[PDB]
């Protein structure tokens, strides 16, 4: 809830502030990256001075033995080429432990997130989550991961990843924890040069239940705005690769007759599917007024453009000149949009594109039939409970520095 929020790190007025009302101070030291589309998200580096220090108000500094408390945040951990990061070395990212290492710590290893809670005596307890290397499509590597940690002093400390409990260890043997005055977001003792992403850091003075953690997981990023593959906001005038949720091991390619094939198997780099394969698309506003946002929202009316080259976009349309119920998606070399629009929508991180006639008529969700990308109305009545239901769901993969494949 909000009655339990004793620290909330939010972006406001050129910097980061505490919106809890307990007035904790937040200081940026050096080069801290601010995400232009969501400045609540920040990147810390380790090749130069780059840190965020939260000086906690004297009233909220944890100094009890029986007080239940929770920590919530999202972390983004790039693996780059997936070799530079392959080293057994626990490096810390968030440090709230005093001179005698009393308090709590969040530390990372190769494809691992570790939570450490140490008392005044020196007794400690750890939880961990190892998501492992990409086997097809990884749901964690270079994506936003929602980390939650609840601590019942008369029971177990629990670690949640994306709202699901994954590790619980009893903390009954821990006495008094006097956490640090400062919470330091900084990459300390990392073998390699890297950066880490943090957002929505919260401290609560109770043990959050699964329901509250799920409410946080669902509501913290704007549910109105569509998400990209990495979990950032989906943008207009941005090149994206496509991923079909039901066919993750396949990518979309162009055919000479202007149709789109899905019968292309993604190459692998040591069990990891290539994400930067196939056609590129761009989302374009139908009515671009003074809409001060490049963010794609639910039920936005858009054009989906195929990218032949950087400066050559062609409309993607549904070819309704067929007796078939499903209509093949084609590329229009002439620039003709054929009196169609696309309605964007979403189910969590999965995106839907509804091809419609300008007269208000439905042509169908973007899916596939056999080996060709099509628009089909079938999905309308089979979106949840069917083997083929997820065929209408898509992810938009942006080519970024944090995921390298060559």
């Amino acid at each position, epitope marked *: 809830i909000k009655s339990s929020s004793v620290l909330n790190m939010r972006y406001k007025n050129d910097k980061y502030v505490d919106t809890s009302g307990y007035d904790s101070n937040i200081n940026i030291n050096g080069d801290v990256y601010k995400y232009p589309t969501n400045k609540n998200q920040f990147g810390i580096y380790n090749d130069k001075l780059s840190e965020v220090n939260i000086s906690q108000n004297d009233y909220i500094i944890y100094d009890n033995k029986y007080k239940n408390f929770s920590i919530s945040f999202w972390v983004r951990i790039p693996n780059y080429d997936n070799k530079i990061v392959n080293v057994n070395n626990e490096y810390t990212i968030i440090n709230c432990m005093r001179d005698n290492n009393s308090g709590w710590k969040v530390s990372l290893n190769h494809n691992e997130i570790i939570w450490t809670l140490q008392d005044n005596a020196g007794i400690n307890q750890k939880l961990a989550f190892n998501y492992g290397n990409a086997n097809g499509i990884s749901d964690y590597i270079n994506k936003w991961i929602f980390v939650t940690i609840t601590n019942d002093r008369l029971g177990d400390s629990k670690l949640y990843i994306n709202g699901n409990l994954i590790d619980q260890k009893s903390i009954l043997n821990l006495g008094n924890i006097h956490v640090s005055d400062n919470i330091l977001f900084k990459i300390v003792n990392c073998s390699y040069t890297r950066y880490i992403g943090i957002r929505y850091f919260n401290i609560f003075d109770k043990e959050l239940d699964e329901t509250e953690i799920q409410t946080l997981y669902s509501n913290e990023p704007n549910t109105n705005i569509l998400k990209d593959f990495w979990g950032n906001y989906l943008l207009y005038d941005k090149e994206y690769y496509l991923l079909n949720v039901l066919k993750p091991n396949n990518f979309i390619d162009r055919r000479k007759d202007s149709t789109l094939s899905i019968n292309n198997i993604r190459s692998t780099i040591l069990l990891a599917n290539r994400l930067y394969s196939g056609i590129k698309v761009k989302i374009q506003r139908v009515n671009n007024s003074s809409t001060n946002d490049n963010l794609v929202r639910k039920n936005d009316q858009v054009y989906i453009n195929f990218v032949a080259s950087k400066t050559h976009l062609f409309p993607l349309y549904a070819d309704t000149a067929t*007796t*078939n119920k*499903e209509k093949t998606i084609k590329i229009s070399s002439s620039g003709n949009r054929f009196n169609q629009v696309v309605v964007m929508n979403s189910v969590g991180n999965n995106c839907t594109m509804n091809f419609k006639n300008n007269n208000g008529n439905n042509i169908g969700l973007l899916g*596939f*039939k*056999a*080996d060709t990308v099509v628009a*089909s109305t*079938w999905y309308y009545t089979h979106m949840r409970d069917h083997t083929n239901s997820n*065929g209408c769901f898509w992810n938009f993969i942006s080519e970024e520095h944090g995921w390298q494949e060559k």
Partner: nanobody
Amino acid sequence: LQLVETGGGLVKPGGSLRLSCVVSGFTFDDYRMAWVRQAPGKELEWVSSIDSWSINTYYEDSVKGRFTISTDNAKNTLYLQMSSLKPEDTAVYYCAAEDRLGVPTINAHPSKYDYNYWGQGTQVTVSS
């Protein structure tokens, strides 16, 4: 990723025929197998389909009763037992594979993109 049909021949009205389609590159677990006929002067006409994972078989309104689609227990050979042959059955008969994960619509007048793989075809002629 290939299909080869055989078993087509010249028959009299009321005769019988057993068409077989051997596949290479995939089994019938991830593809729905189909028979499509091309009669001279006509467009492609869907004959039958089988879901190998399930016990679900489909037939066009006419054929049903005389034509039976089957698959082996190795899930890589497709059969169509054709009995009580009429002379309007005379056509080229193709075996086709549809990705089962796609939209499960069955158009009666399909184009090339309605199935992943088409065979070479086998001629069935019913002459008096």
